[PDB]
Design a protein around this ligand. Structure first.
Ligand SMILES: CO[C@@H]1[C@H](O)[C@H](n2cnc3c(=O)nc(N)[nH]c32)O[C@H]1COP(=O)(O)OP(=O)(O)OP(=O)(O)O
Ligand SMILES: [Mg+2]
Ligand SMILES: [Zn+2]
Ligand SMILES: [Zn+2]
Ligand SMILES: [Zn+2]
Lengths: 257, 49, 115, 528, 8, 49, 82, 428, 67, 44
RNA sequence: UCAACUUCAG
């Protein structure tokens, strides 16, 4: 009547990728952890743009869109920063946001590639993952882009600009033994990378008592958060959601009594 | 002088005729624009065969 | 023009309860928990953990409409057990499992590095 | 002239009196919504904020209406106008009007359209009376009208850019008249053909056929999840069909909970062997064909368009004729919801692998085509040597054309039968054809085996050039390839001449549709 | 597009 | 376009290579408005002398 | 006509039901006294439906025969279609 | 070979098509001469000696695919689709959103749609090169799954990925241009561009006139909501009448460019262009290159969309029930070829009558890159994580955003303006 | 018009890779080999660079409104 | 206000009821020039 | 403003 004790084994850990295996866990828990990776890990990204001068070919809201999609280092202070809604101050302040500035003019004849490097942040911890560079716009001679932007904390449920991850690869039952997918012709199907079967055997024998366990994950970071801390923040955020739910449930049960 | 005849764009009598793509860009015309239409009262009209 | 704001997906508007509990009259010892501003992430976790409990006769969740943001969880338990207690125990078990996962993931990180 | 003002369409008599532009009407694009009921329609907030319903202030609704008036036109659940007893319309949009916000009995608050309002829904042309039906409003985000997919067939609507008109009754009297005479559940059975107008369609039909196979076995969690979407559920989980070794319910066992009351029906599945009824296993039916619903429980059978579709004697028709229109509405909605979630589990697709056939099948198709071309060559030689003799009532040209057409059609049918034999159980073209959701065996055959003869004006492709069809063919060639026969399948790809001939056939079909619309419209107007 | 007895 | 005769609209065999078989408007103008094929050219005229 | 020599159907037609319910609804919305004891129903159409079920709508339908004669059938006398 | 080698060196060899005509290699034939000419579709297949059909070929087609026009030439594998579907695709490709011209910034045209990120097709016909479809493409390649996911793709609708849409997928700009000319008709009656005054000008409206500049014209870069006053024009009344132009209702744009010139008459003439950035909604219409369109049924985020083992979630989910009745097999072959091209790095060739590109060859190529021959893929349910039992056909297909959008079509009426003659509600 | 930041399907940053892709194409690398060198693995990401048409260069030919 | 010239791209200030002709080039197409007030764009 | 035209949607 109680929760199972999961186990983790990390196979690969690189600055861009974490490949790990979670065993003795439910499919619902595993899938929701993946879902939280995608949508409920807080990150820092530009959400306020004010363009003082835009003579580039791209219109202002095109530039704003591209600026928002630019990833920003959010490793440590995203936990410290507050949401704009939570912050007491009106509009935005150092605690609820980070300020960026762009002042680029193509005085020279050669085309000027405005990059993420040209974005200058007021706080050193958030930088546009520059330490090529993301190209915001190309400026012909006599064309100038000036803007001020504010970057706020948020998660991918609001907007895909706040997705901390690129591709979460989630696989269970690498050799089809629970028959959750029924192949019309099993032999035509390529073997998985995690498959332990011999080349002759296309599918493992049907396991009637089996349950999905030993889930395999490959989480690729977008660069804003380290791939390890994406997973850690996702686990902590899911636990916090459950704890908030429990608090409200206890309050309403007390109210009913 | 007896009248004025509308000139089909990029025809032999159009100003854009015989101009390289750089010259067309200097005049704010597209190099890729086919021509074959008339500008009458500021609107592009195409004679349909 | 009729696009809902994005923050509607998870932010409660003023005067909205996160959880509302309504008993189910059709069957004895059954309850229906309506969670507002929640999605399949919490619903599937809770339904699975409730199914693991032997005294829970029925556990299910549904999103009544994809465009709206709500979760309805029906829980029916055996006599001598309360569906509200089953819900609380499910949440606590999931919290404990997730904390254990966190600890072991931190240990695995520290071991993959530094060796 | 005065005559021209009154004469035709757009004249006063027909364009302004028999029909006229009306207020309280809204048009927008329609998108599907499986989650809405039959009678429910989905209305964007902007459309609901512009359109209003006047509600008389009574002692029992004065508080709610005064709150709505306080909210005003800006906040959505509000009121646009207040009509006094004198008829003076206080405007809530323009300026607070604090003295004029007061309501007394007899005032009319023009509140915004809310959930539960009855609205007429229309699609042009209104060919029959099911094209205008009464729907209960539900306000949903975004800007499209959202309607249940069972209601698409009466409206002749698909969600590919179609739009629907919406008319809001403005009086309680006309609201009651609409609700009783025109509500969607009351329109299920048409008087035109004494059949249901609406049936299970598209994904739900295919997924119902898959769901009601003998093979489908559902574990405890899946059963609970599906029962969650059954609104009429009694709260009691049926005892599973297989108690040991592991408790596993059956698709039929759960679908038996959908069927309302105690409904008795006997149908037959589309792939029902004609031999089974005569021979043994009448009531065992090795293929799980036939359909027997006793006491509202699906004892045996696989459901398709013959059981859950728009046909006389269907489970839907029997439900309407026996349990009533309200319970039938619930029946439709529950079928759609729980079967769509099971389809989320099982899934459905179409791919290239469906179009591919066995190598032996392709070889047989090629042999059949070779034999047919040889037989057409033999017939042409008989005609050239004057051995052919005219069929009574036909010229030699006509009898030759009929013989060649018969040979080509027989070969086409044989190739189609070979392709259909090739189809596996897992084949998804076959799944959709068997369920009746979309497609036909003709389409499967053209996809896999042979596109068939391209014919214009009821004859093979005419000799448009001088005594030949295309410049590539020699003059006086009556063989299959020259006159339009397409031996390649769509998957194989048409050769250039076959491509042009196929374009000729498609053009003829399009012309037929376009010409048909106007003549049929004139006939319909005359009859009415 | 099928045959003479079918459709164009 | 008003004429309902299905003779003038049908794709004639002589349209091969000179008018697109696929590209036609749908409605009152099926087969009445056509489009040149890619390699089609239209004679400009010459003196027969 | 009289209670005798009533030739029209005893059952209330769908059109009569619709118009009676709408008319009673409009009267109820116009502060007309309500015959049935409403069980917390504040919608005039729902109250009219409730009265129709209880056969307490105070309306008599005058059905015009094609010869010009009329028959007065009370709502209570008519058998409810649903 | 001499002619082909010289044409291959075309530039800096001064050899062209006219030299090919002058050599007598090619000839122009009209319909009357087409009646008297024996043609071969291909040289190798037909001219070469075989069982002799014809031994008097007088001409040969340069390529069969040239029988198609401009709009039908973009259709990939048109010989594998049903014929009416190619007509539908021609009609719909005339309606796709893309960069219509490169000088679109200079032009002030009413009703201009331009797409953010156009892409060239991964599966392309050769004749597209001569249509400049690479230079000015209209549509985006998109990962498409042909599946029945939640019932919101049923009939002809399409489910879309909201995360992809949020990353710039099919985002467009709609430019609306308004023209107004100040003119003098009466000797004492003239129209002047000016900011209308509540007291000085008799005609006024509730609409804000503050955004108007001193000249009476809104400056560029000012947000203008529906019914705001773009241009302020007042007529002297023989005090003043307001003829100021207003935004079309629900335009809700930002002014892009305001040009002030003199027309032929010499009167002042003003053109104001308004940008509205339109993100895909759940009413907008998207169509493939194979004649099957559909509105967006619903938008699911990346967490909700089904995912493969690699983590790929379809940008677009189309109902499988579209394929069978319509028999647009070119759609399936294009998905397979696009998968092969994207994994290989080449651009697929979909010329109509290639005869060197079978479906089997594409399948064998796809097998080498680690995927199923037929393009099916094991998809995991986004909501529950369980593998979908039926493996689902996924691949990169080219999709076009048609100009028909729901925001332009949504309308409602409630006691609005009324005609003078009929005294009935107005039209439009 | 310009290389999109982030692949639509997954969200991996592809905006920094266009100039490197063009340079690798200039080197000698085939399109597939250049895509592999840049690190694009899933066909969703390879579609972004492979199918991209850079119109910003054509638009930069026109002279700016204000100089 | 101040109108930028279409061709020579030099700002010229033209009063109301004055012919639209740029000084030093004579081009008859002017552009209104971007507003001083600034509009907030959500990067979304 | 109203008439006319053309182009589209289903
Ligand atoms: C199915 O019938 C409908 C209706 O009858 C209505 N309709 C459409 N055009 C007209 C018209 O001109 N005049 C009148 N009176 N009615 C008209 O439209 C018909 C179909 O047309 P379609 O055949 O193009 O529908 P796809 O098969 O093409 O649907 P995809 O796959 O694109 O979504
Ligand atoms: Mg349609
Ligand atoms: Zn702050
Ligand atoms: Zn990607
Ligand atoms: Zn100048």
């Amino acid at each position: 009547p109680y929760a199972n004790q999961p186990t983790v084994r990390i196979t690969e850990l690189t600055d861009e990728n974490v490949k790990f295996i979670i065993e003795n866990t439910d499919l619902a828990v595993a899938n929701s952890i993946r879902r939280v990776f995608i949508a409920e890990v807080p990150i820092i990204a530009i959400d306020w743009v004010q363009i003082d001068a835009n003579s580039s070919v791209l219109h202002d809201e095109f530039i704003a869109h591209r600026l928002g999609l630019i990833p920003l280092t959010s490793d440590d202070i995203v936990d410290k920063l507050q949401y704009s809604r939570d912050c007491t101050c009106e509009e935005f302040c150092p605690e609820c946001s980070v300020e960026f500035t762009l002042d680029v003019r193509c005085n020279e004849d050669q085309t000027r590639h405005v990059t993420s490097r040209d974005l200058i942040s007021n706080s050193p911890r958030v930088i546009p993952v520059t330490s090529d560079d993301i190209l915001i716009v190309k400026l012909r001679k006599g064309q100038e882009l000036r803007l001020r932007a504010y970057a706020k904390k948020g998660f991918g449920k609001e907007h895909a600009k706040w997705n901390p991850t690129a591709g979460v690869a989630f696989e269970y039952d690498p050799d089809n033994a629970l028959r959750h997918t029924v192949y019309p012709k099993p032999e035509e199907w390529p073997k998985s990378e995690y498959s332990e079967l011999d080349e002759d055997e296309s599918q493992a024998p049907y396991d009637p008592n089996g349950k999905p366990e030993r889930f395999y994950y490959n989480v690729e970071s977008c660069g804003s958060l380290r791939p390890e801390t994406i997973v850690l923040s996702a686990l902590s955020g899911l636990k916090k959601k459950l704890s908030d739910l429990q608090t409200q449930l206890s309050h309403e049960i007390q109210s009913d009594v | 002088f007896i009248g004025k005849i509308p000139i089909m764009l990029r025809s032999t009598y159009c100003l854009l005729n015989g101009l390289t793509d750089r010259d067309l860009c200097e005049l704010n015309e597209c190099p890729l624009d086919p021509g074959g239409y008339f500008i009458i009262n500021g609107s592009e009209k195409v004679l349909i065969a | 023009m009729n696009a809902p704001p994005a923050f509607e997906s998870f932010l409660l508007f003023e005067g909205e309860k996160k959880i509302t509990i309504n008993k189910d009259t059709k069957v004895p010892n059954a309850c229906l928990f309506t969670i507002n501003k929640e999605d399949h992430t919490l619903g599937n976790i809770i339904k699975s953990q409730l199914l693991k409990d032997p005294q829970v006769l029925f556990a299910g969740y549904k999103v009544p409409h994809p465009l709206e943001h709500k979760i309805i969880i029906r829980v029916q338990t055996t006599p001598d057990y309360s569906p509200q207690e089953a819900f609380t125990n499910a949440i606590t078990d999931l919290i404990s499992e997730l904390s254990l996962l966190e600890e072991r993931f931190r240990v695995a990180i520290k071991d993959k590095q530094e060796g | 002239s005065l005559k021209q003002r009154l004469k035709g369409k757009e004249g006063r008599v027909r364009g302004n009196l028999m029909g006229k532009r009306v207020d309280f009407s809204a048009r927008t694009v329609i998108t599907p919504d499986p989650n809405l009921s039959i009678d429910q329609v989905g209305v964007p907030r902007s459309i609901a904020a512009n359109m209003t319903f006047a509600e008389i202030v009574t002692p029992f609704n004065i508080d709610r209406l005064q709150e709505l008036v306080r909210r005003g036109n800006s906040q959505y659940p509000g009121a646009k106008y207040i009509i006094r007893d004198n008829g003076d319309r206080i405007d809530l949009r323009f300026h607070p009007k604090p003295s004029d916000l007061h309501l007394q009995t007899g005032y009319k608050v023009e509140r915004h359209m809310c959930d539960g309002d009855i609205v007429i829904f229309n699609r042009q042309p209104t060919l029959h009376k099911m094209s205008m039906m009464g729907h209960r409003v539900r306000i949903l985000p975004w800007s499209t009208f959202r309607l249940n997919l069972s209601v698409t067939t009466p409206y002749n609507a698909d969600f590919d850019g179609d739009e629907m008109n919406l008319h809001l009754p403005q009086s309680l009297e006309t609201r009651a008249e609409i609700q009783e005479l025109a509500m969607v559940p009351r329109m299920i059975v048409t008087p035109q053909s004494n059949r249901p107008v609406m049936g299970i369609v598209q994904d739900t039909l295919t997924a119902v056929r898959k769901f009601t196979k003998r093979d489908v076995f559902l574990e405890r969690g899946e059963v609970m999840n599906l029962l969650m979407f059954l609104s009429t559920w009694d709260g009691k989980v049926p005892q599973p069909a297989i108690l040991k070794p592991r408790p596993l319910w059956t698709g039929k066992q759960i679908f038996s909970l959908i069927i309302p009351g105690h409904i008795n029906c006997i149908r037959t599945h589309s792939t029902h062997p004609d031999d089974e009824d005569s021979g043994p296993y009448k009531h065992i039916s090795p293929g799980d064909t036939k359909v027997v619903v006793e006491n509202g429980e699906l004892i045996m059978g696989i459901l398709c368009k013959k059981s859950l579709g728009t046909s006389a004697g269907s489970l839907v028709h029997i439900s309407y004729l026996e349990m009533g229109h309200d319970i039938t509405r619930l029946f439709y909605s529950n079928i759609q919801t729980v079967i769509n979630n099971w389809l989320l589990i099982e899934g459905h697709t179409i791919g290239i692998g469906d179009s591919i056939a066995d190598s032996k099948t392709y070889q047989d198709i090629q042999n059949t085509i070779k034999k047919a071309k040889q037989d057409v060559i033999e017939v042409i030689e008989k005609a050239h040597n004057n051995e052919l003799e005219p069929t009574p009532g036909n010229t030699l040209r006509q009898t030759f054309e009929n013989q060649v057409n018969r040979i080509l059609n027989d070969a086409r049918d044989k190739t189609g039968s070979s392709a259909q034999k090739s189809l596996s159980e897992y084949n998804n073209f076959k799944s959709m054809v068997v369920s009746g959701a979309k497609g036909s065996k003709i389409n499967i055959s053209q996809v896999i085996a042979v596109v068939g003869q391209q014919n214009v004006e009821g004859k093979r492709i005419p000799f448009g050039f001088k005594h030949r069809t295309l410049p590539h063919f020699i003059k006086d060639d009556y063989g299959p390839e020259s006159r339009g026969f397409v031996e390649n399948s769509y998957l194989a790809g048409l050769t250039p001449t076959e491509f042009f001939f196929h374009a000729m056939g498609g053009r003829e079909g399009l012309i037929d549709t376009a010409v048909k619309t106007a003549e049929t419209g004139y006939i319909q107007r005359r009859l009415i | 597009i099928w045959g003479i007895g079918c459709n164009p | 376009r008003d004429g309902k005769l299905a003779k003038p609209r049908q794709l004639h065999n002589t349209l091969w290579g000179m008018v697109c078989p696929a590209e036609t408007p749908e409605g009152h103008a099926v087969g009445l408005v056509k489009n040149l094929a890619l390699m089609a050219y239209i004679s400009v005229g010459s003196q027969p002398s | 006509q009289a209670n005798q020599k009533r030739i029209t159907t005893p059952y209330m037609t769908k059109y009569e039901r619709a118009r009676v319910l709408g008319t009673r609804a409009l009267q109820i919305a116009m502060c007309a006294p309500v015959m049935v004891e409403l069980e917390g129903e504040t919608d005039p159409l729902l109250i009219a439906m409730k009265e129709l079920k209880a056969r307490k709508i105070p309306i008599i339908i005058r059905r015009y025969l094609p010869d010009g004669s009329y028959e007065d059938w009370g709502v209570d006398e008519l058998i409810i279609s649903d | 070979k001499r002619h082909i080698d010289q044409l291959k060196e075309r530039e800096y060899n001064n050899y062209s098509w006219q030299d090919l005509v002058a050599s007598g290699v090619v000839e122009y034939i009209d319909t009357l001469e087409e009646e008297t000419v024996m043609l071969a579709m291909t040289p190798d297949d037909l001219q070469e000696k075989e069982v002799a059909y014809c031994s008097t070929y007088t001409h040969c087609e340069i390529h069969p695919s040239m029988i198609l026009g401009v709009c039908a030439s973009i259709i990939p594998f048109p010989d594998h689709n049903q014929s009416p579907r190619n007509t539908y695709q021609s009609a719909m490709g005339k309606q796709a959103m893309g960069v219509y011209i490169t000088n679109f910034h200079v032009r002030m045209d009413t009703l201009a749609h331009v797409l953010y990120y156009p892409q060239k097709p991964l599966v392309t016909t050769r004749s597209m090169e001569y249509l400049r479809f690479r230079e000015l493409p209209a549509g985006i390649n998109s990962i498409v799954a042909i599946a029945s996911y939640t019932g919101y793709n049923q009939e002809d609708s399409v489910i879309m990925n909201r995360s992809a849409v949020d990353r710039g997928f099919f985002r467009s700009v709609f430019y609306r241009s308004y023209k107004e000319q100040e003119s003098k008709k009466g000797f004492d009656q003239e129209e002047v561009f000016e900011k209308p005054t509540r007291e000085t000008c008799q005609g006024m409206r509730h609409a804000i006139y503050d955004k108007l500049d001193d000249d009476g014209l809104i400056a560029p870069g000012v947000r203008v909501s529906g019914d705001d006053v773009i241009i302020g024009k007042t007529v002297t009344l023989p005090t003043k009448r307001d003829c100021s132009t207003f935004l079309r209702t629900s335009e809700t744009g930002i002014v892009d460019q305001v040009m002030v010139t003199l027309n032929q008459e010499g009167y002042k003439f003003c053109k104001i262009r308004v940008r509205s950035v339109r993100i895909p909604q759940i009413g907008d219409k998207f169509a493939s290159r194979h004649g099957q369109k559909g509105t967006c049924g619903i938008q699911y985020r990346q967490e909700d969309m089904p995912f493969t083992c690699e983590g790929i979630t379809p940008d677009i989910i189309i109902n499988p029930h579209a394929i069978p009745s319509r028999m647009t097999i070119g759609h399936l072959i294009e998905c397979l070829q696009g998968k092969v091209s994207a994994n290989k790095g080449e651009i697929g060739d979909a010329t109509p009558f290639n005869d060197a590109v079978n479906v089997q060859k594409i399948s064998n190529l796809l097998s080498d890159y680690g995927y199923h021959l037929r393009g099916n893929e094991v998809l995991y349910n986004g909501f529950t994580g369980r593998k979908i039992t039926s493996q689902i056909f996924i691949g990169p297909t080219y999709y076009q955003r048609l100009k028909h959008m729901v925001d332009d079509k949504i309308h409602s009426r409630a006691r609005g303006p009324i005609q003078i003659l009929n005294r009935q509600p107005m039209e439009g | 018009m310009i290389i999109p930041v982030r692949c639509f399907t997954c969200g991996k940053i592809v905006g920094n890779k266009w100039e490197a892709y063009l340079g690798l194409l200039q080197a000698e690398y085939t399109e597939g080999d250049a895509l592999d060198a840049l690190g694009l693995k899933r066909y969703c990401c390879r579609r972004m660079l492979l199918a991209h048409v850079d119109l910003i260069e054509k638009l930069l030919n026109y002279a700016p409104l204000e100089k | 206000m101040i109108y930028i010239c279409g061709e020579c791209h030099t700002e010229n200030e033209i009063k109301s009821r004055d012919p639209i002709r740029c000084r030093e080039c004579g081009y008859r197409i002017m552009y209104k020039k971007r507003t001083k007030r600034l509009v907030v764009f959500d990067a979304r």
